[PDB]
């Protein structure tokens, strides 16, 4: 996307979102990142929406195919599951590569740094969902390390109701429950996150209250399913 203006790539990413063309949206946002400038808050959201939709479709397909393959336990189901898996891994590697070259290293404010480290944890988590054996172990530790650095910054630098802090805690709790075989850690984190946010709601405007309570409900939903 090297010949397109940065501002045009951003404009086209917004149009692609409206048209539900998420692969296009991700390509436009990759082009925008590769211009080398830092991303604004809105632009970071566009990058995340684009890739979350792309990898979300891949994960759903991988789960369908993995379930068929397990039931069957010709080569076609395994071969096709492997194809989808390789494509998913390629998208995760692309996102991780954008974060490593050079979004994280240039991110000095807490909001941007926490956002990118949460993304790094998420994309290693998606790699971990399809990994097997020893490579699973190092992938899992990479996810954990990214989430932990993000958590450490968020606790020092953001209020407990900040939506990025809340979403980070939500996703790290999912990591603990689904990836790390640590359901007690997942439950503890979701409970403490919810309780500390509830005690800070009194400080918020009506609009911020809505933003924070929406994510708090997701924490509550998980706690209900896990307990």
């Amino acid at each position: 996307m090297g010949s397109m203006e940065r501002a045009s790539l951003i404009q086209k990413a917004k149009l692609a979102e409206q048209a539900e063309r998420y692969e296009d949206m991700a390509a436009f946002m990759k082009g925008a990142v590769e211009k080398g400038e830092e991303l604004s808050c809105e632009e970071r959201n566009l990058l995340s929406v684009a890739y979350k939709n792309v990898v979300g479709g891949q994960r759903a397909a991988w789960r369908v195919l993995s379930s068929i393959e397990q039931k069957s336990n010709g080569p076609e189901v395994r071969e096709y599951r492997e194809k989808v898996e390789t494509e998913l891994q390629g998208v995760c590697d692309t996102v991780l590569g954008l974060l490593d070259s050079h979004l994280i290293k240039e991110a000095g404010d807490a909001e941007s740094r926490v956002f990118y480290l949460k993304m790094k944890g998420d994309y290693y988590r998606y790699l971990a969902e399809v990994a097997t054996g020893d490579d699973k172990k190092r992938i899992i530790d990479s996810a954990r390390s990214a989430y932990q650095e993000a958590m450490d910054i968020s606790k020092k630098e953001m209020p407990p109701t900040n939506p990025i802090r809340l979403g980070l805690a939500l996703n790290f709790s999912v990591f603990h429950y689904e990836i790390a075989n640590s359901p007690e850690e997942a439950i503890s984190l979701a409970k403490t996150t919810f309780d500390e946010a509830m005690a800070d709601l009194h400080t918020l405007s009506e609009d911020s209250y809505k933003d924070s309570t929406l994510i708090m409900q997701l924490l509550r939903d998980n706690l209900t399913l896990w307990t």
Binding site: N45, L46, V49, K52, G167, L170, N171, L218, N222
Partner: peptide, 9 residues
Amino acid sequence: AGSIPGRRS
């Protein structure tokens, strides 16, 4: 269970 949906800007 459920992570941040994050599908809509």
